[PDB]
């Protein structure tokens, strides 16, 4: 059986678009094709700019590393927030070999392995750039005699917050011994994600005094001045402009979710924006009308669900209190210049005022909610432009079919679910997951996991499993269990076990042991003793 293997390959026996028909199965297939294509132009237009921004991030970071590296002690560079993925490159400078040696905590079990891997990388690079040797520091001593050139070593310590600090300290003390050779210069790069003082108090003070002779600091992290986030979101604003507008609650959802992630908040922002765009082009049938040439494709269903807008509600209530298709197709030309205004106040903000430590997503949120003035009343340098930069948003009509909003709770179920809360809620309120359609037994008795969880939730530190099984029995009804267990005359073993006077307790024990080891696999319950199996401890509590 394939169920008892570890891994197996299946080739299924085969005998084109994942988008479905909307408007209760009345959407035409050409609208499905247009939705697929138009989603792909919006997605490609977003990710082209995302790719250029990402290559700009690596290019500028490589430029500043090369600047900080080349302008009798180590040249030390502390890279804060590194989350190391950079491919550092060095100069092709004559009469001196420049070798980059990268070391990880997996490659660092002791000092001897660090030195051996470093000298093997050094000899491999020096042979590839242009008899066997010992992989120790004497290769650094005789480097000019074997290759005729000076040596510039740059050590890239990847993930210093994972390396053993005694081993790293002793390796740095070992590398200090190469300072008596005139042909050697050494650079050290420490990739830090916690703090400088954290590594400062895990190293001895003599090593700290050694590193203090020539050291520089540089911030690497993606939230450095927000300018790499502010590009990407603006790229989304360069993609969706004139087509859809962002909701304020969706933008503050972006703000809260990016505030919860340290090292990688750019890709989380891209993932949330992509999933919102996927949800829009999968759910709304009006996304064909984003292209302005589909305005002849209106039907009765489109106008029937078009009239159910709060903006159209307020508009027709105002026009009734005062005194459809042509009204709809002419009002699709306005540009909604909030994105252009946001880009204008951004380029005004670092054009001459030299204010660069702002979040454009915060600015766009406060511009959406109408509280922009409270946002730029913080810097105390832009007091003279409270009317130059003032904007009032205009609530347009039927824009709620053309929008990206977070109110259905789909983003917080698909991207950031309350995982364990969902598990315990489906355990406890099971009628919610299971349909309410063994006809006489399914109405009366719960599934065994849900009933066992409801008895589990109302218990103490230690649950005695025999008394807990008795509490599980008293919830079950004996009569319809004995009736339903006799409802299959093909299996005679079940009938003769039902005829036994201890049938009900036995069947309840079958269900109880199966459900207990289901909870033990899921992690809800724990046997504290390896033997005996007479008591259990609860592990998890609902609503934490």
């Amino acid at each position: 059986a394939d169920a008892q293997r570890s891994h197996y390959t299946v080739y299924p026996s085969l005998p084109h678009i994942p988008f479905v028909k909307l408007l209760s199965g009345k959407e035409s297939e050409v609208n499905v094709e247009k939705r697929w294509e138009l989603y792909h132009q919006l997605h490609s237009h977003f990710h082209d700019q995302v790719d250029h921004i990402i290559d700009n991030i690596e290019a500028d970071l490589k430029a500043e590393i090369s600047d900080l590296l080349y302008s009798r002690c180590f040249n030390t560079i502390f890279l804060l927030g590194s989350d190391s993925t950079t491919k550092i490159e060095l100069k092709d400078e004559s009469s001196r070999y420049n070798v980059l040696i990268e070391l990880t905590p997996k490659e660092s079990p002791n000092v001897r392995m660090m030195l051996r891997r470093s000298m093997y990388k050094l000899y491999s690079a020096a042979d590839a750039e242009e008899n066997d040797v010992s992989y120790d520091l004497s290769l650094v001593e005789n480097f000019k005699r074997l290759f005729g050139k000076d040596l510039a070593m740059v050590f890239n310590f990847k993930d210093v917050d994972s390396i053993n600090f005694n081993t790293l300290d002793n390796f740095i003390i070992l590398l200090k011994s190469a300072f008596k050779y005139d042909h050697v210069k050494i650079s050290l790069i420490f990739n830090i994600n916690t703090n400088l003082s954290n590594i400062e108090k895990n190293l001895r003070q003599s090593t700290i005094r050694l590193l203090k002779r020539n050291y520089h600091k540089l911030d690497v992290s993606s939230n450095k001045g927000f300018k790499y986030g502010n590009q990407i979101f603006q790229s989304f604003l360069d993609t969706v402009d004139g087509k859809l507008n962002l909701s304020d609650r969706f933008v503050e959802f972006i703000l809260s979710k990016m505030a919860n992630n340290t090292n990688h908040n750019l890709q989380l922002l891209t993932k949330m924006l992509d999933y919102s765009l996927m949800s829009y082009f999968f759910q709304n049938a009006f996304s064909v009308f984003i292209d302005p040439v589909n305005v002849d494709f209106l039907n009765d269903d489109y106008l029937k669900i078009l009239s159910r807008c709060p903006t159209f509600m307020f508009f027709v209530e105002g026009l009734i209190k005062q005194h459809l298709e042509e009204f709809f197709v002419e009002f699709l030309v306005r540009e909604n210049p909030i994105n252009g205004h946001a880009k204008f106040v951004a380029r005004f903000l670092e054009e001459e005022l030299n204010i660069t430590n702002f979040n454009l997503i915060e600015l766009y949120h406060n511009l959406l909610i109408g509280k922009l003035d409270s946002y730029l009343d913080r810097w105390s340098a832009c007091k003279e432009y409270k009317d130059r930069l003032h904007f009032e948003p205009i609530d347009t009509i039927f824009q709620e079919l053309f929008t990206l909003d977070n109110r259905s709770g789909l983003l917080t179920q698909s991207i950031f679910p309350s995982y364990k809360s969902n598990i315990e809620d489906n355990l406890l309120s099971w009628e919610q997951v299971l349909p309410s359609l063994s006809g006489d037994l399914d109405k009366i008795m719960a599934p065994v996991l849900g009933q066992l969880f409801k008895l589990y939730r109302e218990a103490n530190m230690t649950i005695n499993i025999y008394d807990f099984y008795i509490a599980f029995r008293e919830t079950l009804p004996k009569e319809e269990i004995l009736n339903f267990i006799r409802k299959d005359p093909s299996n005679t073993k079940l009938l003769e076990l039902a005829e036994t006077p201890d049938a009900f307790d036995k069947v309840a024990l079958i269900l109880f042991m199966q459900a207990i080891f289901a909870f033990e696999n899921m992690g809800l319950i724990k046997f504290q003793s390896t033997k005996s199996y007479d008591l259990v401890e609860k592990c998890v509590w609902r609503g934490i």
């Binding site: 093997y120 000899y123 491999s124 042979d127 066997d132």
Partner: protein, 485 residues
Amino acid sequence: VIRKFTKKNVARAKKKYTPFSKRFKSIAAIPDLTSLPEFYGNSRFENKLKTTQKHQIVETIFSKVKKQLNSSYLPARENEFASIYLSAYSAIESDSATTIYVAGTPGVGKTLTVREVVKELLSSSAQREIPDFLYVEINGLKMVKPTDCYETLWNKVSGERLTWAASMESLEFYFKRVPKNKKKTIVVLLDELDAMVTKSQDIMYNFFNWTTYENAKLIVIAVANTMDLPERQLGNKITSRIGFTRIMFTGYTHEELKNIIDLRLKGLNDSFFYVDTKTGNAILIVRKVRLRMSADAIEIASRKVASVSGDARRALKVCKRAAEIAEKHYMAKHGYGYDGVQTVHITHVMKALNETLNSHVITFMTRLSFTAKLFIYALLNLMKKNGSQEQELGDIVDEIKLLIEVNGSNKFVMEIAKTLFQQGSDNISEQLRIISWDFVLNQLLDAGILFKQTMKNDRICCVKLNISVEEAKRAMNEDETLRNL
């Protein structure tokens, strides 16, 4: 191409890899292997240890006794000899395959008896009453690798040199598939059988399973040190194949040991030599000097050796040591050099038996310095006080300091205290350890008197006596200062 490491001292032998199953294309293609020029045994180093003798060495009156009592030169083993010889002769004459298990303590004549059996069997084969056979000797303690026996035996059979695995399938093919008429009988002595025991036990199974093959014509004579070896270390298959019959070589009685020593001392005891009084050289038939070694001395040595081990090596060595003590006294008395009655008396035999019994440990502890004795006294005091067999070194330091500072009124302590804590010197401050503390600690560790655990904190590190406590007590109260306090 750059290597991650180098092996610059690899020495590989010229051993082929193709086994004997692929030499010929068929079973019928194999010739009679007894006619092949390389099969069945068909030294260059003996001249390397030759020199030119330009002196004349002196062999004295006891020189012939000491040379003759060596192990290089079969009275008491005649039932074991008859059993091994009759089983092996029946196995040779019927063209059978047979295991003979022989076990015993060291020096009871196992290897000697099996070698005498195979010499009489080869002499019997030379008279054309049993078919000719090849004798192979494999000693498990003379192998570097246990699998080298596979290398050895096949090299004795074919004359080829293969690696051990290919030799193993070569031996399997030879013993099972080749018919009897194309083969020769092989008698293998496996000596030190326990040395050929591995975790897989494949060598044991193979060597005893080839004796269960119909075509093999293999006689394996296995020599063990215990009789319960196949039950203790080997599986039930190998124990079943070895068999129920097992020949035990008991330790020699003192009659048998006396017969062995008298057999080596026939022609020399109660004999006359011509002895030069100018140099000392003696010739078996200038003075006519009679040589005796007394039978009471031999019987005392034989009884002692028979009760302790029953070992012929020890009986011969005790007699040779007694003769060497007598010959040393003889050369001291007559002033002879290394160019009417002389007797190996019973006193030399008692000296030879007592020189391995005299307990130098107490003498060594008696002839130590005062600091080492003070250390041992302090350790014994701590074992008396807190009743523990392991004492921390800081406790020993503190109780040495207490022993100095309490019995100060002893005149020896007033003489020694400045030496112990300042090395007899002003401008040397008072020391936390005594002078030569680490020296006497390492010295007692070198002798095996002490055991020290491996800790880096010198105060909480434990020290235990490896020697018995009573001999340390008698060595300590032999000392006049330490027994006074």
